Amino acid sequence: DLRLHLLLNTSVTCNDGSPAGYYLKESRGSRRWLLFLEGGWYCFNRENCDSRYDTMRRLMSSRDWPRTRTGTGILSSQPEENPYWWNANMVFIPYCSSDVWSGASSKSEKNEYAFMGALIIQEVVRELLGRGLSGAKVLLLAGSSAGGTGVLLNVDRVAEQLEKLGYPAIQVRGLADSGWFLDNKQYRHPTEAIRRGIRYWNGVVPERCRRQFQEGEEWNCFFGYKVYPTLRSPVFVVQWLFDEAQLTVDNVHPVQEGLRLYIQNLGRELRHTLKDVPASFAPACLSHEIIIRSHWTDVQVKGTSLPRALHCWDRSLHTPLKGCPVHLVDSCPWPHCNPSCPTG
Numbered sequence: 001d002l003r004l005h006l007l008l009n010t011s012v013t014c015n016d017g018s019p020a021g022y023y024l025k026e027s028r029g030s031r032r033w034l035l036f037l038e039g040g041w042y043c044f045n046r047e048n049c050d051s052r053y054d055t056m057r058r059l060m061s062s063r064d065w066p067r068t069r070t071g072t073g074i075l076s077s078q079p080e081e082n083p084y085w086w087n088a089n090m091v092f093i094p095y096c097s098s099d100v101w102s103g104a105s106s107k108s109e110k111n112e113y114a115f116m117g118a119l120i121i122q123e124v125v126r127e128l129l130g131r132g133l134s135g136a137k138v139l140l141l142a143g144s145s146a147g148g149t150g151v152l153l154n155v156d157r158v159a160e161q162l163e164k165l166g167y168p169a170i171q172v173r174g175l176a177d178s179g180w181f182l183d184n185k186q187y188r189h190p191t192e193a194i195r196r197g198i199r200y201w202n203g204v205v206p207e208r209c210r211r212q213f214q215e216g217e218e219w220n221c222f223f224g225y226k227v228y229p230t231l232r233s234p235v236f237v238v239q240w241l242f243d244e245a246q247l248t249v250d251n252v253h254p255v256q257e258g259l260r261l262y263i264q265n266l267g268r269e270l271r272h273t274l275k276d277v278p279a280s281f282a283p284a285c286l287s288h289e290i291i292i293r294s295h296w297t298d299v300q301v302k303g304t305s306l307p308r309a310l311h312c313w314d315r316s317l318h319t320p321l322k323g324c325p326v327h328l329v330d331s332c333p334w335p336h337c338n339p340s341c342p343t344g
């Protein structure tokens with residue numbers, strides 16, 4: 001139901017120089033716009049990116065993209081599947097820059113690949129303004145996995161871009177799903193890869209965070225708990241307490257005491273980082289991503305689903321609201337101690 005549009009500025013490109021783009025389903029009766037950033041890891045040097053080009057080429061090129069995609073989960077237009085924003089204008093922005101949405105570098109003499117993720121977002125926004133986004137009341141920049149980190153890295157830049165273009169009435173907000181990671185010690189012997197990636201991509205981080213950590217330390221701003229406090233736009237954080245990608249980088253794959261303590265400490269640490277995040281949804285589950293799967297409605301924390309929490313967040317942005325909470329973090333300490341966790 002979402003139709004592909006390749007960027008009219010064909011100098012804003014995927015890794016291989018093909019045009020980036022976006023999939024759009026308009027809803028003319030709505031002033032809500034949802035721009036979703038796809039995830040899919042990243043690549044950080046020539047050899048690593050060459051491998052990704054061989055077997056993950058859709059994440060590096062628009063040459064083989066389909067002309068349409070179906071909106072699912074928070075991108076669904078069916079109220080039963082999407083109680084939150086079923087009537088919104090839906091935009092899916094494919095991830096084809098392999099840079100966690102941070103890059104601002106073109107392919108050239110010196111560069112085999114272009115890493116333009118930050119510019120792709122800006123150009124999508126610019127071209128959407130002429131397609132109805134100029135009339136928006138809310139622009140929700142959402143994303144999952146690398147796209148969720150992408151939200152944290154880009155939401156304030158979108159807000160600044162719209163102000164500078166003359167649209168101060170559009171409220172820019174972020175929804176970061178499964179992009180809130182810890183730079184913790186591994187269970188058995190990632191920050192090096194991002195550090196290298198940033199130099200390779202000419203990657204950019206939000207200004208206030210950059211100014212805190214200073215030259216050479218911008219990698220810190222890829223970690224939600226460090227970049228989030230520096231952001232001005234409202235951001236809702238969705239994060240499984242035992243995210244499978246976090247456990248993978250931690251090299252966690254009958255559980256003895258050392259691993260039990262490691263897993264319990266990870267959940268405690270992640271819960272701690274969310275204590276001062278007033279709009280958050282963090283179930284005690286071992287899983288990965290939430291917002292674009294069709295059954296995203298099923299999980300609940302303290303009896304409240306994510307679509308409900310997001311609706312309560314909308315109301316809060318019109319004192320806490322009676323019966324309509326926005327801060328929902330499990331306190332139970334082990335995967336699937338929440339009975340509503342996904343099973344299979």
Ligand SMILES: Cc1cccc(Sc2ccc3n[nH]c(=O)n3n2)c1
Pocket residue numbers: 039040041042100144145146147149179181190191194222223245246
């Ligand atoms: C070290 C770091 C910090 C923040 C974001 C990233 S990028 C990433 C990390 C995990 C993951 N799982 N699925 C997916 O796309 N990603 N992307 C890397």
